[PDB]
Structure formats: C-alpha cells, structure tokens
C-alpha cells in the first residue's frame, strides 16, 4: 500500500507537470499566431482558406424564420397572416405622403390603444359576431383619420386574438410594412436595410444611448427629439424613411430592449423580402468579392438568399464566425485556440 501511495504521488505530479507544460505550449502558439496574423494579407489568406471549407459545408436543412410571427402562441398567428395578406392586397393603393401619413396615424392610434386599455380589452374579444366591435372603432375615429386606415382596423378587430398585446403589436407591424413598401417604391430596400443594420451596430456598441431611450414612463416627444437629433447630427443618414421607422418604433417601445428592437426592425425589413439575416465576425473587413463568395456559399447552405453583417473585432485573430438565427459556424482561429487550450490532457 505504501508503494501504491508513492506511485500515486509520482503519477499525480507527473500529470501536473504535463498540464502546465501544455498550458504554456498553447500560450506560445497563441502569441505565435497573433504575431503571424498581424500580416494584413495573412488574415485574408486565413478567411478565404476557411471559405473553401464553407464550400465543402453543404447541405443544410434550413427553415424560413419570421420576425414575431414565430413568437405569438396561436390564434394571433392566423390573425397576423390574415392581416398581412390583407395588406398585401392593399399594397398598391396609397401614394408617397399617403403611406407616410398611414404610418403616422397608425402609430398615433396605437398610442390611443395603449392609452385606454379597457377599450383594447373590449375590441380584442375572440368572439364570432364581432360586428359591434367594428362599430366601436369607427365610433372612436369616425372623422379623425383616413378611410383605408379605418378599413384595415375594421378587418383587424374582426379577427380573433389570443391576447391584447398581439393586436397592439400587429397594428405597429402593418404600419411598419407600409413604411417598408414606401421605402421599396423609392428603390432603397437594401440601402435602408443595411443602414438600419449599421444604426443597430452603433446603437448596441455604445448602449448608453440605448438605455436612455428605454425610459418607459417618460413622454416620447423628448425621446424622438433626442433620437432624430443624434441621427441627423451627421448626414450619413440622408434617407429619412429610416428615421421615420425608428422614430415611430421608439414611440411605443413598451420596455423592449432598444439594442434588440432595432435589430428586430432591421430583421423584419429584410424578412419582407424573404431573406434570412446572418451575422458574421472577423478581424478585418474583406473585399466585396469575398462578400459575394460569402453570400453565395451561405445561400447554398441555407437554401435562401441571405445578407451579412460584418462586425469588426480584431481579437478574434482572423477567420470568420457566422451566426444564422440560433446556430453558429465558428471558424475564427481564436476560438480554435481556446478549444485546443481547454481540451488539453
């Protein structure tokens, strides 16, 4: 037994030495890769090396993802798809100022709904002979707003809803769809999408502005003042419809995370086209040729057209790390370093 004990201590200190050997080994490899990849060309070499592995990544049984339609439990979904089909029928009616005033009045009546909860409860009964409800709503704004507005509100309240916040958010959603069509007519769809994404970047990376926009109880006039003001502080946001969207969204934040709400806005904007968002991270921005490579290989993977968002971070030490919805392909070399470190014997 004493012999066994001495063998135990010998072998255990042996394993200890092995471990602190491997740790400094991975340290040395880490600084070696860090000073090697400092070559601006070698970062591109690594990423387009990973790109051929991506070329040998097919296939993937991807599914289309929806902005909030996949969030509502039931009864509200059917209602939401019915209303989006109704607005798809509406799609060509309104004109420029038509659509913009549609959005303004719809967000105003959303404020009106969230101002009187009891009337929302009443108009959100999931009953069959909903006709008194529709009377109610026109009784509210018979001479206050536009006619197709009142029509779509009628067909909305005609539907059944599992809750109250579902209809509240649905009218916001159809107003956003109207603004999306307005931006579409102008032909800036990818422009507005990527500018919302970039504003989401600058909103999340310095979340102070995000939180000071999340003030629930504070009135929203100063909120939108602050917001637009910070936006048109520079004119790299020449497009005004982005400002319209974000303003009439922050008007009814309802305690939502701004740093997530703006991503939600961008994602529904891209989802209008049927594309799937795909965030990516790397250490240095690549040429737009490599962007074409990435978009084509990701479309081949997920069987849908996709858009990217390159959030620069050098600490990833080259390579890419992509995330599509709720799965991740992590090829950046720093993740491999952490893996080989944690998987030491």
């Amino acid at each position: 037994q004493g012999a066994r004990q001495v063998d135990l201590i010998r072998a255990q200190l042996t394993r200890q030495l092995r471990l602190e050997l491997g740790h400094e080994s991975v340290r040395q490899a880490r600084e070696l890769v860090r000073n090697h990849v400092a070559d601006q060309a070698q970062q591109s070499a690594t990423v387009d090396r990973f790109l051929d592995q991506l070329d040998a990544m097919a296939p993937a049984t991807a599914d289309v993802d929806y902005p909030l339609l996949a969030k509502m439990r039931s009864a509200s979904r059917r209602a939401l798809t019915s209303l989006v089909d109704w607005f798809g029928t509406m799609a060509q009616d309104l004109d420029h100022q038509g659509l913009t005033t549609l959005a303004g009045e719809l967000v105003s009546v959303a404020r009106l709904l969230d101002r009187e909860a009891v009337v929302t409860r009443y108009l959100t009964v999931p009953a069959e002979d909903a006709t008194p409800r529709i009377r109610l709503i026109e009784r509210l704004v018979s001479g206050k707003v536009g006619a197709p507005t009142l029509e779509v509100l009628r067909t909305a309240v005609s539907k059944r809803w599992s809750a109250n916040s579902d209809l509240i958010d649905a009218i916001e959603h159809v107003s956003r769809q109207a603004l999306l069509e307005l931006a579409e007519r102008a032909g800036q769809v990818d422009e507005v999408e990527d500018q919302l994404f970039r504003f989401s970047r600058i909103l999340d990376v310095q979340p102070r502005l995000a939180i000071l926009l999340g003030d629930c109880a504070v009135p929203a006039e100063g909120r939108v003042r602050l917001l637009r003001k910070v936006l048109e502080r520079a004119d790299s946001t020449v497009n005004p419809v982005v400002v319209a969207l974000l303003s009439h969204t922050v008007e009814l934040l309802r305690g939502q995370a701004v740093e997530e709400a703006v991503l939600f806005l961008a994602e529904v904007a891209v989802a209008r086209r049927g594309e799937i968002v795909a965030q990516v991270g790397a250490a240095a921005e690549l040429s737009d040729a490599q962007r074409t490579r990435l978009t084509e290989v990701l479309s081949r993977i997920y069987g849908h057209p996709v858009t990217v968002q390159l959030h620069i971070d050098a600490a990833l030490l080259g390579g890419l790390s992509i995330a599509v919805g709720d799965e991740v392909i992590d090829g950046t070399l720093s993740s491999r370093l952490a893996a080989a470190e944690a998987r030491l014997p």
């Binding site: 255990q12 979340p207 102070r208 995000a210 939180i211 995370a257 740093e259």
Partner: protein, 469 residues
C-alpha cells in the same frame, strides 16, 4: 456609465438593473447609498440571482430602511472579502470584515474572498485522535476527535452556550495554535460576555472573533459564518498550525437562508425550509475540515427547533459531524448538567481500536444500563418500583446513580450554581464508572453523585451525607 439602478425593494431583497454587459457575476458585492441623515449608510448587496433582462436580485447585508428606488449601485467587481493574517487575532470583527473595537484596523491586510471551494477529495484524511476535555460524560460516551468535527445539539436554552464556553475554557485556554469564534445570529449580551471573559483569561490575544447577531438582517447572519470560516481557512492553509473553530448556533445560517428563500422566488420545502437546504449546508460544512497534515478542530452549536430532532435542519446537520453531544430538555428538567442525553449522543472514535477495550466496555455497559432504565421508567411510574424484579430494582438504583454521576459542576457554570468547577481525567472516569456498573457504590445515596467531579469528590459528598464507600 456602468453602474446600476435600484428597481425593487421588498424587505432585505433588492432588485437592481444594470446595462447590458455590465451585469455583475453571482455573489459579487454591490454598494448602494442611503442618504437619510438619521439612517445614512452604505448598503452592501450580495448578488444572489440573475433575473434576466439585465435584472439582478441581491440580498442586503444591512437594513434597507431609507433606500430609494433608482439610486446608483456600484459594482465592486469582486465578492465580499474579509481581512486575513496573523493580525486579526485579538480583535472583534464584522461579517463584512470591519473591526468593531478599533475601526479601520485591518484595511491594509490581505483580503480573502469569503467564498471558497472545499478541499479536493484526495486531500481528505480521517481523524481518529481523541481530544480529552475533562467532562465525565463527554470523555466517556462522546469522546471528541482531535482535528475532527464536533457539535452540540439541543433545543432552546438547554446547555449549548454554556457548554461551548466550557470547551473554550478547557481546550482553547492551553492551546498552541489559533482560535476563531463565529457568533452566527446569537445574542449580543453573550458576545460581549465572551469578549470580556477572553480578555480576562488572556486568551483574546490568540482568538479572532467574528460576530453577526440576531438583530442583523438575514444577509449578515448568512455570511458571518463564511467570513469566520475564511479566517480559519487562512490560518489552516497559509500559516498551517492547529486552528480551533467555534461557531455558536450555526443553524442561524440555515434559518437566515430560509427567511429570504421565498423573497428570492423559490418554492418552499417540507417544513418551510428552502429547497436548497442540504446543498447550502454542504457547501458551507465541507469547508470546515482538516486536510492532510493541516488541522482544524471544529466545534459548533446546533439549535434544534422545538426540541424536534427530526426537523430537517438538525437532521441534515447530523451527517457532517464526527462527534455529537445531544442535549435534552428531559435531562435539563431533572437538574442534571450538562444535560447530555447519553442514549442519543455518539462519537465515531468510540471504537475498541481507538479508545481501548476497557473504555469501550464501560461505555457500552453504561449505555445498556441507561437504556434498560429508560425502558422500565413507565412501569415504575404506573405500577411502582416494588413490582419489578430484584435484578431490575438493583439495575434501577445503579442507573439512577449513574445518570446522576454523569452530571458535573462545570467551570463555566459557576455563575449559575456558585460552585467552582471540576476536571476529571479519562482514566479516573473509566474506573469510576466501572465501579458504578459493578455496584461498588450501591450503598451511597442518590445524592453525593450529583454535580461532583471524580471519586474523591464522591467520597467527600458521601461522607457529608453520612456514608462511606
């Protein structure tokens, strides 16, 4: 910036909101401010749960009276730390690590986090060395383990505090190491009593006291044991010399954890305890241990709620101890002190291979006699003693003399009986109880056995009543 904001205050539990990415880890220490001039202070909050949506549920260590919603909460980036080193000896400390008798003392010491992991299993070693106290019943039936885990169980007001004072007098007065005393949710009068009495016996210069008492909110009563245990762990791991750790009513740790379990949003367990009862008791009780070559002789008092030894808190504490001295109120009501239940108390070194053959034989015979007496007591109460056998009457006389001879006049009870204390070596105890069980003193009255020391005291008090032996 990267600070917090108080959102909810429901008693001692405070909800705080932080920006995304600046959420403090679990068990961090946050600081909030109470500016009301009559109650102005700096609240320390210990992060307990991550509520989601950047919310954080914390437990306050000071009373939250005067705390406003929306005030700034500063994340210290670390857990609660206490001063450690050979310089904490001789001073009364806080649950936060603040010196009470000399404020500011110890802010320049090394500071250790009060949250540790228990030693690895390959470092644990069984302890089978007897710690001779000097009490007849303890030395005979519940031999304490040197470097092991000892506890005193008992209801409300039987003998626990007096017994721990007695053991501080016996074991710690002539010790070659360090002593640490944690007063976990106990009286403050007793804390001042201990402070003064350790200053009198010149023991304070070797002892470090850490007090969080009954008037403190449940956070202090939940963390004071961890603070004192961190001091003891420093004395064991860095200095490495023979720590003594006394803890008064450690249970108060469990009770303080139970007072806030519903405010933290946990469904209650069987008897109204937290669902995490045994898990927290194990996380705490596994750090109180002696590793290989490094000794901590621990001694805790365990309150048994409503004298029910089936209550989940003592029933869960029972599994962490090497020796248990279990005090009864039935023995307290008879005037026998210390009120040890000889049939319930136990020790793991009560082994013929550890204490010897004669010690073990005498202890087993005493236990058998007392069990037979407890079995006959009801018959004797209803039908009378004259209904028994002659063997049974002999055994009943012997058992009454034995249960009176297990009592003793302790050194720490002079304040309650006016009588000075006694000390009896273990060999004298063994031989005395051997003579009792054999029947050498069946002619001495039942008194003259009551609150005395060895056999010389027995002879003195027997002759004081007109008898010999």
């Amino acid at each position: 910036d990267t600070s917090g904001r108080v959102v909810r205050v429901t008693g001692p539990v405070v909800d705080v909101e932080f920006p995304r990415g600046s959420i403090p880890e679990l068990f961090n220490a946050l600081h909030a401010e109470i500016t009301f001039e009559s109650l102005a202070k700096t609240l320390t909050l210990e992060v307990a749960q991550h509520l989601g949506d950047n919310l954080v549920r914390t437990i306050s260590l000071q009373p939250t009276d005067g705390l406003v919603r929306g005030v700034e909460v500063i994340d210290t980036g670390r857990s609660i730390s206490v001063p450690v080193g050979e310089g904490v000896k001789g001073h009364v400390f806080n649950a936060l690590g603040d010196c009470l008798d000399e404020p500011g003392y110890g802010e320049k010491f090394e500071h250790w986090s009060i949250h540790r992991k228990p030693p690895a299993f390959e470092e644990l070693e069984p302890r089978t060395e007897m710690l001779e106290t000097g009490l007849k019943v303890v030395d005979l039936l519940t031999p304490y383990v040197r470097g092991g885990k000892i506890a005193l169980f008992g209801g409300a007001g039987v003998g626990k505090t007096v017994l721990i004072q007695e053991m501080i007098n016996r074991i710690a007065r002539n010790f070659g190491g360090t002593s640490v005393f944690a007063g976990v949710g106990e009286r403050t009068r007793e804390g001042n009593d201990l402070w003064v009495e350790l200053a009198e016996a010149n023991v304070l210069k070797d002892t470090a006291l850490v007090f969080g008492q009954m008037d403190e909110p449940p956070g202090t009563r939940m963390r004071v044991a961890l603070s004192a245990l961190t001091m003891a762990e420093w004395f064991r791991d860095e200095q490495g010399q023979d720590v003594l750790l006394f803890i008064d009513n450690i249970f108060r740790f469990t009770q303080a954890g139970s007072e806030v379990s519903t405010l933290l949003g946990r469904m209650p367990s069987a008897v109204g305890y937290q669902p995490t009862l045994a898990d927290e008791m194990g996380e705490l009780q596994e750090r109180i241990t002696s590793t290989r070559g490094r000794s901590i002789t621990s001694m805790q008092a365990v309150y048994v709620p409503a004298d029910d030894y089936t209550d989940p808190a003592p029933a869960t504490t029972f599994a962490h101890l090497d020796a248990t001295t279990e005090l009864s109120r039935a023995v307290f009501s008879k005037g026998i002190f210390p009120a040890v239940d000889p049939l319930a108390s136990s020790s793991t070194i009560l082994d013929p291979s550890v204490v010897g053959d004669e010690h073990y034989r005498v202890a087993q015979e005493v236990i058998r006699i007392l069990q037979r007496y407890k079995d006959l007591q009801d018959i004797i109460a209803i039908l009378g003693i004259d209904e028994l056998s002659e063997e049974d009457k002999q055994l009943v006389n012997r058992a009454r003399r034995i249960e009176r001879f297990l009592s003793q006049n302790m050194m720490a009870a002079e304040q309650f009986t006016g009588q000075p204390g006694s000390t009896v070596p273990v060999k004298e105890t063994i031989e005395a109880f051997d003579r009792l069980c054999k029947g050498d003193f069946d002619h001495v009255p039942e008194q003259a056995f009551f609150l005395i020391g060895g056999l010389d005291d027995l002879a003195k008090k027997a002759e004081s009543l007109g008898a010999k032996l």
